[PDB]
Each structure stands twice: as C-alpha cells, then as structure tokens.
Design an enzyme around this catalytic site. Structure first.
Site, PDB file in Angstrom:
ATOM      1  N   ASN A  37       0.815  -1.233   0.000  1.00 54.81           N
ATOM      2  CA  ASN A  37       0.000   0.000   0.000  1.00 54.81           C
ATOM      3  C   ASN A  37       0.848   1.283   0.000  1.00 54.81           C
ATOM      4  O   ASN A  37       0.287   2.370   0.153  1.00 54.81           O
ATOM      5  CB  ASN A  37      -0.902   0.057   1.225  1.00 54.81           C
ATOM      6  CG  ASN A  37      -1.723  -1.173   1.483  1.00 54.81           C
ATOM      7  OD1 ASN A  37      -1.790  -1.663   2.621  1.00 54.81           O
ATOM      8  ND2 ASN A  37      -2.368  -1.691   0.447  1.00 54.81           N
ATOM      9  N   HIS A  71       2.986   2.226   2.295  1.00 55.63           N
ATOM     10  CA  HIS A  71       3.160   2.699   3.665  1.00 55.63           C
ATOM     11  C   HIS A  71       4.458   2.091   4.208  1.00 55.63           C
ATOM     12  O   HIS A  71       4.807   0.981   3.819  1.00 55.63           O
ATOM     13  CB  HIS A  71       2.000   2.232   4.568  1.00 55.63           C
ATOM     14  CG  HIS A  71       0.713   2.948   4.309  1.00 55.63           C
ATOM     15  ND1 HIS A  71       0.564   4.295   4.601  1.00 55.63           N
ATOM     16  CD2 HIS A  71      -0.431   2.493   3.752  1.00 55.63           C
ATOM     17  CE1 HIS A  71      -0.665   4.614   4.217  1.00 55.63           C
ATOM     18  NE2 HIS A  71      -1.295   3.568   3.686  1.00 55.63           N
ATOM     19  N   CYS A 114       5.482   7.329   9.533  1.00 54.33           N
ATOM     20  CA  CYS A 114       6.526   8.023   8.805  1.00 54.33           C
ATOM     21  C   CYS A 114       6.087   7.920   7.334  1.00 54.33           C
ATOM     22  O   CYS A 114       5.829   6.811   6.847  1.00 54.33           O
ATOM     23  CB  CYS A 114       7.890   7.368   9.019  1.00 54.33           C
ATOM     24  SG  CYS A 114       9.211   8.011   7.940  1.00 54.33           S
TER      25      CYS A 114
END
Ligand SMILES: Cc1cc(C(=O)Nc2cnn(C)c2)no1
Ligand SMILES: Cc1cc(C(=O)Nc2cnn(C)c2)no1
Ligand SMILES: Cc1cc(C(=O)Nc2cnn(C)c2)no1
Ligand SMILES: Cc1cc(C(=O)Nc2cnn(C)c2)no1
Lengths: 265, 263
Positions: free
Chosen positions: A186, A188, A223
């Site tokens: 995804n 991330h 982050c």
C-alpha cells in the site's frame, strides 16, 4: 502453514535464510518481526480477511499497530527451521491483540514470544475509534473465547508505560530515510522498518557483545515515504537497558518511543 | 531445495511473502535478487562450500563484478516460484553463476539471471586471475559443456556500460546502509546496491512501468559508514543509465542500465 485443529490459531514453519542472519549466523530481530507479520498475514487470509472485515471495508476502517512487544530466548541459526503459532483476541472496544509463540521445530522448545496491540482507525481522516459491536462479532468467531496470552504474568514487561526520552540523548543516528524496499504493497512504511531505525542508534559495541532479549515499541504516528527520521537512545541501566525515541528530523514530531533489554553474550 | 539428478545444478521452491511484494502485489526485483542469492548459497552448501580449500589457505574470496537479471513475469504474493542455478569456470578470468526462474504451476520460464565473479585477496583487496588448483576444485561441480542462461550472441548481459555524465536527469542523495543492509560478515549485501540504483528512478515510471532488465557493474564496495548518491538519466520502452558514487569525493561504486516496459 495451516490453521490448527480447533481453527482458533495458525501455525507455520520457516527455514532461516542466508541474508536473514547477522554476525552470529542467527536471525536478526528484524527477520523475526518479518516472520511474525508473514504468519499474521497467512492467518488472516486463511479465515477470510484481505485484516479488514466486511464491516470495516464498508466504513473505510483499518487496523493500525499501537504497540509491538517481542522477547527472544534463542535466535534460530541459518538453515534452522522455526515454527510460529499465532492467534487473535478482541479486547472489548479498545481494539484487538495478536499474539505469537516461536518454537525450535527440532526440540519443540519455546525460543520466543510476542504480543501486539491494534487500534481501529478511519483510513481517510486518520481518526482513531473504538471497536463497534458489528466488527467485534465478526472477529469473535475466529478468536478463542477464553483468554489465551503469550505474556500472562501479573506485572509483565509487555504492558509497561514507556517515558519520553529527554534531550540531550546519549546516542543518535540522524537523517534516516525509507527506500522502496521499506514500503508495503500500500506504499506505507512497513512496521518492521521502525524496529530497524530504533536499533540504529544502539552503539555497535553493544550489538557486538550483547544479544537483544526484549524490545517494546509504541507507534504514535506514521513516517511518510518522503519523511526523514532521527533515532535517539539513552542507557537507563550484567544486563543493559535503553530508552529510545524516533522523531521527524525537521520539527521533532514523535513517531515512536520504546525500550530494549540486552544480555551480555 | 536439492541438487538435480546429475549433481551439476540445484533447484529450490519459494512461496512469495506478504512483505516481499510491491504495489502490484507481485515480488520486487530486490526480492528476486535475494532469492537468487539464497538458492546460490544453498547450492554452495550442498557441494561442500563459496570459498574452496585452496581459497581459505590463500585468503582468497569471490566478489561480484556484474549482475544481469531479466524478468518476464513477477510472481504474485502466495505464488510458488522454482529457481534452478549452476556455476561455470570462465578460464582464469573468473567464474559465472546462472539462474532460471519458473512458475511452479505452469512450468513456464518467468525470468533468467547471470552473474560474473572475480577472485580477490580478502586482505589487500587485490584482484587476481583464477589459479589451476582452484579451477580444478570448481570443475567437479560445474557442467563441462557450456550451459548459459543468456546464450544468444551479442546479448544484453555482456554489453559495455558507459559512465553517466554530470548533470544527471534525476538523483537520490545521501543514501546510507542500516544493519539490515549488511550480511553476516558486516559487508553491504549486493542486493542493497540494486535498491539504491532504483531509488533515483522517478515514482511515475515505477507506477506506470514494469522493470524488464537490469545490468549492474560492481566497481568498489560501500562501507557501512559510507554515504552514496544514486544518479539516473533517461537514454531512450524506457531505458535509463545509472551511477552510484560516494557522496563525498564522488568515487564510483557502481554503474548500470535498466529497461522498463509500459504496463
Ligand atoms: C511485526 C509485525 C507483525 C504484524 C502483523 O501481525 N501484521 C498482520 C496481521 N494480520 N495481517 C493481515 C497483517 N505486522 O508487523
Ligand atoms: C495510535 C496509533 C497511531 C499509529 C500510527 O499511525 N502508526 C502506525 C505505523 N504503522 N501502523 C500500522 C500504524 N499507530 O498507533
Ligand atoms: C543477487 C545475488 C546473487 C548472489 C549469489 O549468487 N551469492 C552466492 C553464491 N554462492 N554463495 C555462497 C553466495 N549474490 O547476490
Ligand atoms: C572487479 C570488482 C570489484 C568489486 C567490488 O569490490 N565490489 C563488490 C561489491 N559487492 N561485492 C561482493 C563486490 N566488484 O567487482
């Protein structure tokens, strides 16, 4: 891998790879954390998830990690087979918990254990929320109804409150950035990358003379792939204990806090 | 995994992991490169190693000079990929390790790779030619007739790569290895350099194209306390020229080329 006889837990065997081991020819804590996520993912897949439920997809809700706690007694050597068993539990409306037990496949002895806390969040607004009855009911048919805990003990390390590191830090590793290998499907940052970043500020002499026994990590914010992180460490202590803090390089916004316990080799 | 019937090659099956895949839910080129290294290590272990008895006595090691990978289809998350690998002596210039990747269900070739290795003294870091004693110890585990993953004359795997001229079209600066990037000997893993090369490719190319071919030359090692700059220029399908150099003095560590096909 496969679900166990009762269908309330999942087991999988892994052969430790050449690139998965550190200086002692045993798996790193990051390899262990990746194997935990892989068996977690295989368990969700086996019981019909893709770990969003039908109600979660309808309401744009996702599970996000709040805390990861891992305790390793023995790290498996390169070529060894490790067996990991995993299961989930609802913790009322607070969230869910995923637990793991690691065993040596040859001896059958427990070589490690882990526990993680997950909270519900709206995928778009990033707003945390309590678990609703509809989601709780869909999860309960795949979880044991009586409590089953990897860390059952009364005043155990997995539930301890972690303080915020005060400047100046004893040690630091600055300007850490994720590359494409650090991202998931995804886009991330993978939860395991944060464990790596925490460990980067531990001096190499501690790593060379000690083995990591316990790591507790709190996750506060994500982050982004274009963010830069600073990793801060201070000794708090035969055993060595450290307090850790990950924050953005710019404004100093906290992303993680944690503690590690190390035992002399 | 296991050595094949004749004992001159090695096969191993891998189930693609959740954390091993990118945005398309298929294995990254870095996962592919890690699986190539894992089957290579398992092959060396099965035949008694990849330093030989003569190499340990003379403080000699094998070092990569070049890696070339061509992927037709990347395996999806949960798919089983079968990789076959073998080695060959290339006279006294060095050794070569080749790979063939297959879909375990269909049996179709989904990729192939080749790598060139040179002998080096592990202390002085001085390259040398392969001696007769080492060549003889290697030949009992290699096919004696040529067997090549890239047999075609004048193919992509043997092409000379030029040096990127400043200014680069794109760049990714200040790249540093962390502990996960190191191997058991505390050296930067060869696969990390592939990742660093790819970092300077713009995200729009990655989002709309699939990587088809990567050729990478290895000139010098990145130490664990070094900082690298990754440089890329479009030369064209999309083709790029790449350069990895130290952030400080601009010392070349790698050069390469990538070929990308539109999805
Ligand atoms: C470390 C670590 C563990 C996990 C973990 O359990 N991940 C998970 C569980 N279910 N699904 C679908 C994914 N993530 O990072
Ligand atoms: C509370 C709270 C917020 C976060 C958060 O956004 N961080 C994060 C990092 N990886 N995952 C899966 C989530 N975690 O707990
Ligand atoms: C990519 C890639 C492949 C290899 C590779 O073959 N490594 C190897 C071969 N024998 N041994 C003992 C290790 N390294 O990086
Ligand atoms: C000729 C020559 C030297 C090198 C070199 O030192 N670089 C390097 C990086 N990883 N490995 C295993 C070697 N490569 O080719």
């Amino acid at each position: 891998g496969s679900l166990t006889e009762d269908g309330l837990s999942y087991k999988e065997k892994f052969v430790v790879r050449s690139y998965e081991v550190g200086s002692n020819k045993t798996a790193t804590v990051e390899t262990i954390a990746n194997l935990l996520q892989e068996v977690g993912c295989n368990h969700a897949q086996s019981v019909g998830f893709s770990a969003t439920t039908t109600t979660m997809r309808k309401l744009h809700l996702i599970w996000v990690t709040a805390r990861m706690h891992i305790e390793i007694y023995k790290y498996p050597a390169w070529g060894d087979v490790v067996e990991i068993e995993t299961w989930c539990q609802s913790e009322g409306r607070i969230g869910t918990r995923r637990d793991w037990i690691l065993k040596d496949s040859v001896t059958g002895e427990v070589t490690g254990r882990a526990t993680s806390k997950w909270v519900m969040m709206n995928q778009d607004t990033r707003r945390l929320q309590k678990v609703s009855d509809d989601v709780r009911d869909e999860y309960l048919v795949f979880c044991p109804q009586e409590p089953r805990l990897a860390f059952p003990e009364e005043n155990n390390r997995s539930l301890k409150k972690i303080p915020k590191l005060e400047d100046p830090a004893q040690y630091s590793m600055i300007g850490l950035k994720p590359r494409r290998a650090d991202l998931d499907m995804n886009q991330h940052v993978n939860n395991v990358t944060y464990i790596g970043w925490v460990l980067e500020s531990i001096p190499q002499e501690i790593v060379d003379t000690h083995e990591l026994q316990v790591i507790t990590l709190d996750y506060r914010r994500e982050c982004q792939q274009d963010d830069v992180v600073d990793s801060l460490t201070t000794t708090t202590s035969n055993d060595s204990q450290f307090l850790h803090l990950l924050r953005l390089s710019g404004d100093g916004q906290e992303i993680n806090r944690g503690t590690t316990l190390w035992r002399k080799k």
